[PDB]
Design a binder for this molecule. Structure first.
Ligand code: HEM
Ligand code: HEM
Ligand code: HEM
Lengths: 722, 722, 305, 83, 84
């Protein structure tokens, strides 16, 4: 009977009569509310106690069998329940985004610190009491929907502000510049970096011939190549990277005064990155690492938190720099123009349905609000036409603003009608001006908030031509290079050398290092050596760029110079087996909890382990299923029986070797050193903390961790086999 | 001027000025409501006092001008306001319906007279106190959108019942049978009747070679061809035609017993039709006649009302007929199986937005509800697949049930997810069986309303073969013929003759006429004569079918033998110019209103005319703008100046000649007879009412109108130049 | 036997042992050009071929679904039925948002003398070259199945397939348009199109919203005059004028710009219907202009402009 | 699924999907129609002498094997499957 | 807005002018809201007074003296008519 039951209608109950699973945001954080989420409640489905039905509302009695001509016969065309279930499934998929297909979404809110009326009339930047809702999607660039999170790529960062005066979309990246200057080159650049069109190889990688062929022939790309070749290209979390709108925008105030503006997002949890070998392994054992990290951090209360910052330039200072502020391959150095922190954004609710919310969300740089305006940046100008154009195919037509995640929370009356999947039913005149409805809805005068374009002077000739002022390809790459710590420079050389290693045609590699000789002679020579290229005497004498408004370095372009390492919310592995020391774990956990750090007990099997004190303690998962690359640091408590089993276990001995090679902090209590001493690992350096007392060993352990990575270990780490 | 310049600058002031036009149903009849219309209220937005906005909620300040470089310069790509407005316009159109593209909809409600629990468990048929909302779309078949209403064609009649146990679609036609027997022939039939593939000619007509080519080679089509050749093919109004589901369905009661069922709609306003010459002129001067007639019926309170009837056949009687009840080219004569009137449907509210509601509604025969089931009609079986398949591309994907007009008014939880334009947001398990949500939504046992298929026996071999019980093509066409009055038979001969006259290939005309010799010899003879064909004496004695289950004729297949002529809601033209007798008009008007007739005053100009008594009378429209084909009858009041104006007006004199030739009633008061006597018309017959006192004459006029048309005049009228 | 024959597979001849309109390849096969020769690669010739599925499988019985017994239920495994029905279900594509109602023909263009003085445009350089064209004529307001002889602007779109690119001259049969700035097109078109609550009227500007918009926008009056005149109701697409409306530029080999407006001047003259006659034609032949064009080409009275 | 994945009912006209043999029938139109057809688009016709034509089973026309079918209309898992 | 409507009107033969009048009169006669017909007829008084008077008569509109005295546009680069 037990078996027969499973292939018959299921009228009975099936439920049985870290610790907890990820759940929809409405189930785990229902108290994190905002105005947009309340609007989305109108479309949420609560199925408790409901019948299974067709889409026309008809109750289904047997969801286990097709209508057949007998129990062993042929399926009947009149089985409308079967066909409706299969047809819906057949049409589930919609096109992925042409770029940034791979992405993660969360809900939140934004508050302005104080009014910015001095700069902009934008409603959401006027009143610090308002909680204006937001939805953010983070993304990679090159890979399709199912590619890995921790690839070496640019990360996209798109924030939708549901304001009372319109929806504003801030659509940026995690590096302050882009690869190209004119939007007309976007298909060329994207085709070059995407998988090649004959074999569709490789996925989520720029490490191939067509990409570097393009770089080598378009020096304007070099600056942002530097950024992706650095550890910026492999962030540890979406909570620990920076954000930039990249383009110079405009803000107009109540007086009609124009300020040029560049947008910034500064992480409250600091700026931290992976290292390349650890990033690549993480894509094998968890392609969802960033998506999972963001989701769990919100369910844990370590809400992503970012401060919106603005670089502000008076319209008269437009030409005060050695670069064009309209050139998206140029950053504005924070020395020259400081970033004013103007408000805070917090992400505190996961979506309920990924496809409905994250997949269907539409962001366009053209979605501005009164108080913001566009500059003549010729890359931004192309983006204004592309976002809306692509969303008509991806999202089914021109009514994609009626999709719940995309609706504004303000009114939005106009004379537009019809289109595919038209939701609203409009009774009134559909042309303007009309008299039969007394011309409602009516144009809004500027003094009442109607959008106007700032009247910027426009002079020249109709021409296709790159501005003379855009022709500066090497200076900002050099600024970025000289601004990096020694270990960050080595990692940039690593990225270049690994990537060009996968390039088949030699002349592309040669042309690329040749481009590097115009940035820094020692960067070019390091990369040339890793690739067997001998530089000529002429190449070694290649002219280098001078400073930029008297600047040769800028500390802000470095990650590990200004000690932007936050300890709250990091993850620590605790390698325990049966026979571990109970009191140690408690004191490790109490110390970690004191610092906002999460520790996870990893054991050979799942469930519980029993301590030498005879008590049972819950495991978070196996050592095998949670390698060191998923945690920030390892700690091994004492317990002779625990240590003995760990030493027989290849995964747990490798756990420490790999933790070591990836420059992480390793804590060893008591005879735990028994395990370190067994491996081919050198004498404990500054990131190896031994000790017999757990709270003290934990306190010192948490303090090695404040440095993120033991950069000193790097040279001896290379020679360790593992 | 300063007013001139004003028209092309933002319009911030009022445009309105400080018998009625057609209006949305929400403006005209807000009192008429039901559960479906209350649901649609959520999707209706009021624009009064509201700003013109973008779809993102941004107030627009200038709707009159593109963003340009200079007031005489080039248009700029950053004008996101212009591009959004134009892009939405650009994507307004969706594919029209592949058949029945030309249609018109209305809202209403349905009530069952008493419980049908003896025959079915269908919820909406159990409880007379329940008001089930409906939406009904009427249509032609062949024409595209924009084709004319009063073509000679089959009329579609689709009714959507929004019940509490699911949405039920009764998708019918206005004739009791269809052209073909098997769904695999439908594309061939449709391609044959549609415009021809090389030149896309003719629109709205079956009168062309390929259609009659298909008929001559497919005799199974002859029965419905007789229906559409008769006056049933040109109905006067959607309120005055019959409706049929055509197929035999099944009804299943609580005891599991099965009754074979056929659905009927009986119009309380009667069954009446135009004549061919009138129908064709009407397509010229009002292609929207029926769509307008329906709209204005509801606004005038002349609501379309119909009784739902059932022919009810116990299971064991299935094979007691001389034809197969599963054959869709066969009707079940009402003399054999009567139609039981089981309920009433009232259409009492026009839509607000035609596209949102009439264009986007989706109906399928497979959308049945528990208590109803399908039969093995092989045409019906193929229909179940077609309606959902066409809608996935016509309505933009598999979520077209989430478009407001298609949503059910009951719950509809299931495990379907995603698809284009996904409105719902679901959090719970998306598979069945599941334990992580205790298997909600859950399958419903049949005794809780779970849908089940009645366990009909199935025996045979897999094969493609026409059932021998279907090969019976001339019986029912002859039965239909013999059931017609001689006037109706004459018009059938006219339909055939006119249509075949437009076929170019003479052998097509000859082969059709040969098919007619197997239905009736006089019919074949009369059509042959009009086509210049000579029949052999062999053809004049081709064997004819005999009676069907003891009937040679059935008066219910006739329109005019019956007495279904309703005078209320008909239209009357009152021809008048200045100097008309104003007391006469007032008395005519009072009389017409007494019988619910609508008199419209048609003059040589709009505005007002002036009574010979010096009074102003408001005019409905011009004589030239409202020819006699638009009204049911004509009455000319007295006033010698009016009659003398009307006598110099060629259109006014054509009004009487045309209405005379279209067999309509004409009243002439006093000197008005002077107009009639100058026309080359014979002596007043029974349809020409002459009289001096206005009310007296109007009374006799209304009585003549009770007969619809003056059939006796037909031969006299052929001679008349007009 | 004859009766049953019609519901069984037809493996026999059906043709019998003043002339209908026919596809261009059957009536005027000698009239050819480079474009038509290119289209030939996509013409199917079905004489002597088996009826087949789209995957190439021969079909034995096109008269019957696959059932469980001759009186039974249709089976889901009938792939032939579902392929044929599915393709029928998906025949329709959206109509053009304006000019939905239209009529097309192939032809050629020749230049009289080189226009090198004014333009470098390849197709206006060499008089010995026949440039293939395809022309579509249309109304504006009505949907696909609306009548021909309505009162409306007529669209007149010509595709020149030149050796240096496809050039499209997309014009009307009046020399001016109703509005000045594109931002107003959706308002103008919405005002003229059938009204949104009832979708009335078809193929007519004679309704409130259109004239409401005219009354508030005097820039429309010039073209409103053209369509209230007998320009609004032409006798034939062969007897109307054509215009690009807009000023274009033409650039010669020396970089010199001239302002240009385009004109089509019909060789068969400019003739129109009168209003009452045009309205009656829509009733008794809604395809009148479409038919007239097809038939004039078939008779040798080629449209020339 | 392929009607929406590949853009309509004419995906067999995409080169990789086309057969290498003839495939005449009466199907017409649909999105991105590449074939251009002049002949009658319905069957049976006489204006084209009914070409293209059904093929007898003995000349290659597809037929279903006449398998016997006996039972009741039913939603049920075969007991012969419970294993 | 009015100069070229007047040029086009003055170029028409009298029968072509009569047909323009019929076009306006028939179309406006199907407009329901009377103020729309009036506003349009008013617009015509700025093009040609006899055009406006004929159409206003067909629609039963009485024109005011201000309307019959509405200022008309002048020649276009010397032209008042163009027979093409
Ligand atoms: C300043 C450099 C650029 C940045 C920072 C940028 C940023 C982004 C981001 C973050 C997304 C993903 C948005 C999401 O999550 O849905 C995106 C998508 C996209 N971008 Fe860009 N982009 C840039 C340049 C361009 C250019 C030059 C074009 C082409 C003109 C372009 C066209 C697109 C398109 C078509 C999408 C997909 C939009 C969708 O399907 O919803 N972008 N961009
Ligand atoms: C009993 C004979 C039939 C009747 C009475 C019938 C009735 C109708 C009606 C009234 C409509 C218009 C529904 C609406 O207003 O939206 C319609 C549409 C349609 N029918 Fe039929 N039909 C019949 C046979 C067929 C057959 C044999 C097929 C093909 C298998 C078919 C396929 C369709 C399709 C595809 C539509 C368009 C549906 C849409 O786009 O929403 N019908 N039918
Ligand atoms: C100078 C005034 C204009 C003229 C003479 C004109 C002419 C035409 C013509 C002849 C067609 C039909 C082409 C065909 O046969 O396929 C057409 C279609 C169209 N026009 Fe215009 N038009 C004008 C203004 C506009 C404006 C202002 C817009 C909007 C910005 C517009 C948008 C369209 C669109 C969307 C179509 C349909 C194109 C298609 O679906 O293939 N036109 N126009």
């Amino acid at each position: 009977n037990k078996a027969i039951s499973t292939v018959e209608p299921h009228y009975e109950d099936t439920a049985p009569a870290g610790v907890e699973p990820m759940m929809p945001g409405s189930d785990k954080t229902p108290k994190n509310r905002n105005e947009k989420l309340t609007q989305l409640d109108k479309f949420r489905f609560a199925p408790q106690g409901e019948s299974l039905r067709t889409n026309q509302g008809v109750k289904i009695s047997d969801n286990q069998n097709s209508l057949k001509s007998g129990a062993r016969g042929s399926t009947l065309l009149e089985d409308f329940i079967l066909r409706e279930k299969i047809t819906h499934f057949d049409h589930e998929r919609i096109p992925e985004r042409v770029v940034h297909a791979r992405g993660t979404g969360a809900h939140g809110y934004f508050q302005v610190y104080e009014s910015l009326a001095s700069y902009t009339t934008a409603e959401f930047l006027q009143d610090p009491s308002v909680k204006t809702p937001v939805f953010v999607r983070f993304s990679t660039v090159q890979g399709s929907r199912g590619s890995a999170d921790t690839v070496r790529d640019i990360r996209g960062w798109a924030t939708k502000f549901y304001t009372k005066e319109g929806t504003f979309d801030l659509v940026g990246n995690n590096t302050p510049v882009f690869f190209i200057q004119d939007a007309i080159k976007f298909p060329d650049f994207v085709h070059a970096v995407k998988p090649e069109p004959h074999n569709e190889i490789p996925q989520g990688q720029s490490a191939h011939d067509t990409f570097w062929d393009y770089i080598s022939l378009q020096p304007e790309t070099l600056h942002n190549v530097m950024w992706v070749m650095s550890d910026r290209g492999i962030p540890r979390s979406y909570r620990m990277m920076e954000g930039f709108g990249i383009h110079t925008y405009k803000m107009i105030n109540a007086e009609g005064q124009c300020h040029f503006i560049r947008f910034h997002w500064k992480p409250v949890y600091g700026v931290s990155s992976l290292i390349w070998d650890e990033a690549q392994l993480l894509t094998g054992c968890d392609p969802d690492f960033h998506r999972r990290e963001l989701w769990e951090s919100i369910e844990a209360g370590d809400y992503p938190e970012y401060e919106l910052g603005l670089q502000i330039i008076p319209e008269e200072d437009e030409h005060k720099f050695d670069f064009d502020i309209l050139d998206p391959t140029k950053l504005i150095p924070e020395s020259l123009v400081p970033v004013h922190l103007v408000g805070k954004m917090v992400l505190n609710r996961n979506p309920d349905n990924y496809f409905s919310e994250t997949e269907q969300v539409a962001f366009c740089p053209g979605n501005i609000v009164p108080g913001i305006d566009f500059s003549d940046d010729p890359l931004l100008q192309g983006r204004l036409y592309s976002y809306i154009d692509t969303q008509i195919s991806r999202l089914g037509g021109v009514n994609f603003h009626e999709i719940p995640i995309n609706k504004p929370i303000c009114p939005f009356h106009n004379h537009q009608r019809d289109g595919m999947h038209r939701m609203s039913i409009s009774g009134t005149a559909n042309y303007e001006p009309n008299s039969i409805n007394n011309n409602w809805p009516r144009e809004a005068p500027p003094t009442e908030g109607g959008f106007t374009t700032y009247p910027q002077p426009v002079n020249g000739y109709k021409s296709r031509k790159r501005s003379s002022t855009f022709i500066d390809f090497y200076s900002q790459p050099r600024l970025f290079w000289l601004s990096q710590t020694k270990v960050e420079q080595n990692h940039i050389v690593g990225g270049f050398s690994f990537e060009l290693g996968k390039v088949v045609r030699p002349w592309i590699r040669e042309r690329v290092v040749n481009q590097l000789t115009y940035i820094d002679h020692q960067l070019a020579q390091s990369v040339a050596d890793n690739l067997g290229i001998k530089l000529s005497q002429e190449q070694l004498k290649h002219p280098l760029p001078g400073p930029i408004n008297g600047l040769s370095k800028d500390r802000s372009l470095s990650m590990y110079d200004g000690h932007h390492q936050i300890l709250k919310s990091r993850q620590v592995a605790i390698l325990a087996a049966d026979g571990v020391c109970g009191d140690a774990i408690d004191n490790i956990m109490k110390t970690l909890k004191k610092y906002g750090v999460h520790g996870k007990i990893f054991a050979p099997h799942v469930g519980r382990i029993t301590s030498l004190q005879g008590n049972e303690i819950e495991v978070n998962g196996t050592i095998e299923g949670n390698p060191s690359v998923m945690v920030d640091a390892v700690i091994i408590p004492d317990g002779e029986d625990s240590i003995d089993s760990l030493m027989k276990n290849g995964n747990a001995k490798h756990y420490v070797i790999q933790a070591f090679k990836h420059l992480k902090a390793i804590g060893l209590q008591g005879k735990a050193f028994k395990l370190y001493d067994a491996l081919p690992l050198p004498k404990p350096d500054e990131g190896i903390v031994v000790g017999d007392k757990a709270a003290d060993l934990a306190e010192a352990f948490c303090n090695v961790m404040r440095g993120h990575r033991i950069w000193s270990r790097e040279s001896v780490a290379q020679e360790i086999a593992g």
